[PDB]
Write a protein that binds this DNA or RNA. Structure first.
Ligand SMILES: Nc1ncnc2c1ncn2[C@@H]1O[C@H](CSCC[C@H](N)C(=O)O)[C@@H](O)[C@H]1O
Ligand SMILES: Nc1ncnc2c1ncn2[C@@H]1O[C@H](CSCC[C@H](N)C(=O)O)[C@@H](O)[C@H]1O
Lengths: 241, 241
DNA sequence: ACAGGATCCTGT
DNA sequence: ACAGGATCCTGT
């Protein structure tokens, strides 16, 4: 259902389907949570993880923050649909101080609500000629009313203790797809992950996996094959074991 | 809402507002209907009027015509996004035969869908390097599904029997604005109209009036004053009594 | 400056 | 999750 923040490639729509293919588990470990549309909406306990400390931090802070808190920032900087300088300044400040909340308030004003953090910790998204709508408070609330069951981590899937009896939903950057986070992926990672996956299968530990096998001419050769070894659903495919 | 044909200065947007300021009436008499965005969308009975026979006729014919009818013409002349000769020929034909339907099919291909009839009955708009889009069928349908309540007339507002108990929305050529039909207006007409309006006020007969009081340096001096005597809304002003 | 498509947004 | 109305965008 509803995620925490607009996230490119959210699972606000497929989730239901996917949920029709999930098992039992002592702990849901979302290896790639990003938006959180998946974590917030799956019986816990949940280990929300994402290799981007910035956004995880923001989540960690969002924990003890009120809507009123957010507003006080908008009014503090005089943000709005047209406030361009302000946004810059707000961005300016977040870059220097790195206060999560700032980042949070930030994105709502970024070009297409997209959080884009470069390799120096700076927020580069341009002004979105926007502000907060009504999905803003609704999304926010969901998180609040469901963040309890979640345990965040800003680890790289590589080093993430997978404690037996836990389902591991994994929606990694689609190799054959565009998106800010594809700047983190490499063919190697693809390999690693898969191995790392076969490995979880070797411990009875079941998992879920979403991806694209072929999109816009290209196709994920190596993955297309690797999938055969397991079940695949077509809705975009969910390769689960 | 949706008019019958793209018309410079349509009221597809203001209408709602304007309707928020309308009274009851036994007959809606649209003195300047042009595009029809106003007639088709106002509880009838409606007297759609415009001093341009050609476009009114087109309407009168449109009455008993089907979309399929329109297409048969397009295929008949082999019209398209690039068919320049054809357009000319089609125009060529409409000029000679003066068949409304031809004119109808015509404009969809004219430069900016603009119907421009000179003082000799000829269509002069140049080829628009276009053809029919999505809005073409949609606009068409609206008319069909709403033309019933309308009674057309190709009269000059001067001689138009205003039968008591009728609201008279009047969107005449804006004196201080450019547009093909401004070739019909003169400062005198402005005077006349206004008198003609005060006169309807003298019979309890209420009316609606849209115009621009000041636009691009210029201002409708004489009108700006005349308006004070009545109510004025700012959205462009609707001077109603 | 406008159309008309694209997408956004909101309530439901 | 949708409808479709309200906005954003962009080729003329
Ligand atoms: N090398 C890497 N290791 C771990 N996580 C990574 C990674 N590269 C990217 N990621 C994270 O995984 C995300 C995949 S996209 C998010 C999908 C999620 N279902 C959603 O609704 O949010 C990336 O945005 C990034 O946050
Ligand atoms: N002397 C005159 N008598 C009557 N109608 C006239 C006129 N001079 C111009 N007109 C008509 O008045 C129209 C005003 S245009 C208004 C268009 C209409 N609001 C719609 O929404 O499309 C002109 O296009 C022209 O057709």
């Amino acid at each position: 259902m509803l995620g925490a923040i607009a996230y490119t490639g959210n699972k606000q729509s497929l989730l239901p389907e996917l949920k029709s293919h999930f098992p039992k588990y002592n702990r849901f470990v979302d290896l790639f949570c990003g938006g959180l549309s998946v974590s917030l909406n799956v019986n816990g306990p949940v280990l929300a993880n994402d290799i981007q400390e910035p956004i995880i931090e923001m989540y960690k802070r969002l924990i003890n923050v009120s809507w009123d808190d957010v507003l006080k920032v908008i009014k503090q900087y005089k943000l709005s649909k047209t406030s361009k300088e302000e946004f810059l300044k707000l961005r300016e400040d977040y870059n220097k101080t790195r206060d999560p909340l700032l980042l949070y308030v930030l994105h709502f004003h970024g070009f297409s609500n997209m959080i884009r953090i470069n390799d120096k910790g700076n927020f580069t998204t341009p002004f979105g000629k926007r502000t907060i709508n009504k999905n803003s408070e609704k999304q926010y609330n969901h998180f609040k009313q469901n963040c309890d069951k979640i345990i965040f981590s800003s680890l790289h899937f590589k080093d993430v203790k997978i404690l037996d009896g836990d389902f591991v939903y994994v929606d990694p950057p689609y190799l054959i797809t565009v998106a800010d986070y594809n700047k983190f992926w490499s063919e190697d990672e693809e390999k690693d992950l898969l191995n790392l996956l076969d490995s979880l299968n070797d411990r009875g530990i079941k998992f879920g996996q979403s991806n694209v096998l072929e999109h816009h001419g290209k196709e994920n050769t190596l993955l297309k094959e690797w999938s055969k070894k397991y079940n695949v659903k077509h809705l975009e495919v969910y390769i689960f074991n």
